[PDB]
Each structure stands twice: as C-alpha cells, then as structure tokens.
Design a protein around this nucleic acid. Structure first.
Ligand SMILES: [Mg+2]
Ligand SMILES: [Mg+2]
Ligand SMILES: [Mg+2]
Ligand SMILES: [Mg+2]
Lengths: 114, 117, 45, 54
RNA sequence: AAGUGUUUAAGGGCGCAUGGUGGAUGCCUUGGCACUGGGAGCCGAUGAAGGACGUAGGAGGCUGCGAUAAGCCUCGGGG
RNA sequence: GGUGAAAAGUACCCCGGGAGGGGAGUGAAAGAGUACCUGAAACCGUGCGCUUACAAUCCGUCAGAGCCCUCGAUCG
RNA sequence: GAGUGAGAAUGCAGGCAUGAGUAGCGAUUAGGCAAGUGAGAACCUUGCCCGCCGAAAGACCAAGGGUUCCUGGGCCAGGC
RNA sequence: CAGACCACGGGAUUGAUAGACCAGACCUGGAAGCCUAGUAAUAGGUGCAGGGAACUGGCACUAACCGGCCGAAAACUUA
C-alpha cells in the first residue's frame, strides 16, 4: 500500500498565510471533494490549489495507473517563497517598505481504497 | 417602494432612484436582468409597482409610468406587449434567483426575470 | 503652494553652470580639471 | 498608542488560528446526465443553467 | 441511594523526521593593497590631456578608429 | 563574483494560457536545472509521542506518578 | 607573527517576526443594462440609459520631459 | 421594533414568514382628460377626487428549493 504522487508549484503570487487558510479547508479529503470545494469559495486564492491538485491527479493517473476514483489528498505544505521588496511614499517623506510575498505549493496524493 | 432603511445602494441620495429606473427599463426591455442581490431586491417591488400601473393603464397611468421611466419605446412595449398578459396574476410577476459571485469584489449576484407561465 | 525651489530651465542652467562660465574663471577651470581627473561622465551642465 | 512589548508566539498564533474560513455546504445536482456538487444557494440556478460549471 | 473513576483539544508548549525562505561558514578568483630591479619621466598651434557625434550587414554597451571611420600604405615575426 | 570538466541547459509525453510541476532522458551526482559549489542562524509549514480549556508561572530549578522510544535480564 | 574570541556603544551591512492579515487603497460626480474579445472581465471593445465641467474637469501655445505619438504582439515586473 | 459581525426570535409547501394585489385607518389637498364662464391668468361638475412606505385583515400570485453537515453510555466499592 501507500502509493503516492507529488506535485509542486513554485513562485506563486499568493501569500503563504492566505494559501494555508484555504488549504486547511481541504487538508485530508478525497480528490473529488477537493475539486468540488475551492471552486465556490469566496476567496480568490483557491485557483492555484485546485490547479495543483488537478495536476497531481493527472500525474498519478498517467504515470502510476491509479484510478482517480480512489485518490485522496494525503499531504500538503503550502510553504512561503521569496519576497520581493519595494518602497511606498508616505505623508511626511518617510519611505515605507511593501513586501510582495510569494508561495510554494506542494501536495502529495495517495490511494486509500476502503 | 419601501424605504431602504439604511445606506442607499448607489452612493448618496438622488442616485438610487435613477438606478432603479434604469434597472426597471432594462428589465422591461430585455426580459431578464443580472445585477447585484440588493439591487434586484430593491428593483423587485419597483418593477412590480410599474407592472401594476401598466395593468391598470387606461389613462393618467401612462403619465405615472413616464414620470419614472424615460425610454418612450420601453414604455410603449411595456404597455402593449405585457399589457393584460398579467391580468390574471394577482401580483408576483418578478422572479428572483441567486447565482455565483463574481471575481474581485465578492458581491452576491442575482438575476430577475418576468414570469411567463 | 511653494514652487519646490527647482524651476527647471535650459538657458539659465547653461548660463549659470555652463562650460563657458566654468572656463572663464580660474576656480571654474580648476573644478573642471578636478572633475576630469576624478573621471566624471558629465564635467559640467 | 503603540505596541509596548513583543507579542509571544503563542499569544500570536492563538488568535491567528481564528482567521480561518468556513467551507460552504454542497448539494448533488443532475445536469446533462452527470452529477455535480453545487451549493444549495445556487441549486435553483443550476437547474436552469445560469451557473457555469468549468 | 452514596462514593471512586480513565474518557474532549477551538489552539498553544516540549523533542524528533521532513522541507521553503534565507546567503553565513568551508574552498577558489579575471580583482585589490604595499614594495624590489629597470625603461621613460613631460604632453602641445605641424592643433595637447579629456569629451559630443559617427563607423561591423544586424536593437544597446566595452575597445579601436575618424566620412580612407573594429580600418588604409611600407617594413620584420609566426602560420 | 563561483551551475557543472565539457550545455552535454531535460528530445518526447501529461495538467494548464503561461509560470511551474510529474514522468521519460544527459550528467557520477538534477540532496548541480541559467532562482544553479558547500547551504548555517532568525522566520515559516506538515506529521509524529506527551501535555493543557479550575487556571494567576523573569516563564527556570530541585522533587515527582502517568504516557511515549530504546539497550540488556517480568526488573536494572 | 595576530585585522585572533562581542551581548549591548538609541553601533553599521544583509535577511526575517511583532505590531496585523488591522489600518489604508489617496474627495467635494455615480454608475447601470445588453452584446462582444478573452480560459480567467464591475474595471478591455460596440450599442442604450443616468450624472459632472461647460471663464472648463473644452481647445490652441510659452517653459519643461523627449518619442510617452501611431500600428502589430505580451500580462513576470509597475496601476495602491 | 433583534442586530456592527456574531447572536436572538418566526417560517420553510401540513405556510400568511416576507415581496406583490385588494380593502381598511392615516397623510397630503380637489389628480390626467372632457365641458362650461372669462380675449387672458384663473375657477367650477366628472371628485373626501388622484397619489403614498412602516399600522391592520384577506389573497400562495413570487421567494422559503427534488437540500447538506454534526449528533446518543469504560468501569468499580458499600448500603
Ligand atoms: Mg577584531
Ligand atoms: Mg552577533
Ligand atoms: Mg488591534
Ligand atoms: Mg501583469
């Protein structure tokens, strides 16, 4: 048992915290339910997660022959990536710093036929 | 036509009336409108009152309809085509449905239609 | 409402910090030579 | 009003865990023969087809 | 009826396995600093030092060059 | 400042518009993929064993039952 | 033979937490509907409505920037 | 009429919960048209007329949907 397939997406333009917020809603669920959820969610940050899950499913189906009907999200990291720094003027000449954060999504889907 | 009971839909006052008028015009012209949830809710009673005025339309009602709608062709079609089409329905001519929200601003989107039966 | 104390201009710029005015006087020539020795791209305005 | 001291890791995470989202309820709907999940709010629109299904 | 009695983690803490950000540590340089022995120590109206412009068949820089414009003529080296 | 001895810089297939990723290849190494020698500290995640929702702790120390992993012959 | 041992000099260089996923997203006018491009559209293109300036929030020049001017292509980076 | 969000209260086809329609109470003042007197503004009959949102009673005409998730017992001693 324990057949798994991984899928990564690096340099995503989404904050790590906002990505984990949506991940927590799908961590440890079937692939069908995961694709069903994250499509009607109001947060406009579930599209990368859904794309990564779909890519993982396609890879597991085209490289391991695993039936997509028995796939479940086994692990997900959604780590933080590089952060581009920039400046932003203010009231009295002071220069504030704005951080353009990113994210590195990582998922591992396995088969758990009950 | 009940007061909104709170902050109006379109910015400050004097704009919600024009917004509702334009929405009722588009509805009576096309047969179905897709707007924001609260906008459709505020339009429902407005459109129903306009439809009741059209139904009762014999004289002095065209004036009441024109003091709120400006499109002469829209008024003419609402008076002729619709006309007695709702002469049997004792109210409730506008059906409201909710659809998925749009990108950017997560505004609940609704759709209004004219019952045909 | 201040003018920010810049007031861009080409004629006055060249007349007050131009090569001719810098070469007229001795101190200006010395400054030009110092800038050339330092290697500045634009010696004068 | 300014922060006097540095909030501890626990004091920060205990409240950061509250900034979460609530998943919406789903409903099975038969459209074009295939079954798909759509919230009960858009259930009615799913029948008429006013809800695009990617 | 009285008494005893393990059983929950919205989240945090502790130690470990896995990882991202991060560019220090370790190993090197086409570079930089200080001196040894020599050459030569002024360049110019027969237009100096330094710059604008242009030059390869091609969008910009470095360098050479000056409408004879990454080159022209003569004389030696190597191939 | 430094990929790698040599670009030999992943043909081709799959998700997608790409970014990027998974197989299939080169390279000894891809825990060397033009974000590239070695890759620490603070920060951020995930999983694992204990802990806590009657509790007023410069946030440690000395005692100390239970739980967890392991070396020997149920104890030391 | 030391440029040889940092925990501080409101010490300097590079990265990251707290404040917080909070404020703010920069006036005195206000957007709405239909069709279309596009995988992705309230913010892109066409049509119909409502609103603002109209001694201008219109047009032409002086100073100033110098190819932002027009056509085809692109949405990493910049539009708060 | 409960309320920043939350939460509270009523309903969900076995229903008047809300929107629409009818009627009532109430507010406003005599609506558009016709005709009449006045060259004229203007007034008079159609007219307690026309218009209106919160208050009230009927009316399923429209929306509460062929709909989704949590959610119930170690054990032992004495009387
Ligand atoms: Mg020292
Ligand atoms: Mg230190
Ligand atoms: Mg606060
Ligand atoms: Mg872009």
């Amino acid at each position: 048992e324990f057949p798994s397939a991984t899928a990564k997406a690096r340099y995503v333009r989404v904050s790590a915290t906002k990505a984990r917020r949506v991940i927590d809603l799908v961590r440890g669920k079937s692939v069908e339910e995961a694709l069903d959820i994250l499509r009607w969610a109001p947060q406009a940050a579930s599209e990368p997660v859904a794309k990564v899950i779909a890519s993982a499913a396609a890879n597991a189906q085209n490289n391991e022959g695993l039936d997509p009907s028995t796939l479940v999200v086994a692990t997900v990291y959604a780590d933080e990536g590089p952060t581009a720094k920039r400046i932003r003027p203010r009231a009295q000449g002071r220069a504030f710093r704005i951080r353009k954060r990113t994210s590195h999504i990582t998922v591992i889907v396995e088969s758990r036929p009950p | 036509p009940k007061p909104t009971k709170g902050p109006r839909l379109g910015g400050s006052s004097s704009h919600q009336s024009a917004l509702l008028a334009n929405l009722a015009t588009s509805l009576f012209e096309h047969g179905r409108i897709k707007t924001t949830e609260p906008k459709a809710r505020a339009l429902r009673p407005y459109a129903e009152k306009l439809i009741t005025h059209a139904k009762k339309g014999a004289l002095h009602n065209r004036r009441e309809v024109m003091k709120k709608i400006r499109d002469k062709d829209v008024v003419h079609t609402l008076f002729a085509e619709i006309g007695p089409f709702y002469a049997d329905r004792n109210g409730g001519y506008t059906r409201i449905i909710k659809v998925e929200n749009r990108k950017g601003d997560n505004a609940p989107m609704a759709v209004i239609e004219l019952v045909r039966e | 409402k201040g003018k920010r104390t810049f007031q861009p201009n080409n004629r006055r710029r060249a007349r007050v910090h131009g090569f001719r005015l810098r070469m007229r006087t001795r101190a200006g020539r010395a400054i030009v030579a110092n800038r050339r020795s330092k290697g500045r791209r634009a010696l004068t305005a | 009003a300014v922060p006097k001291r540095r909030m501890s890791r626990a004091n920060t995470r205990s409240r950061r865990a509250q900034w979460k989202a609530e998943a919406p309820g789903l409903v099975t709907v038969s459209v074009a023969g295939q079954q798909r999940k759509v919230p009960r709010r858009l259930l009615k629109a799913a029948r008429l087809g006013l809800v695009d299904l990617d």
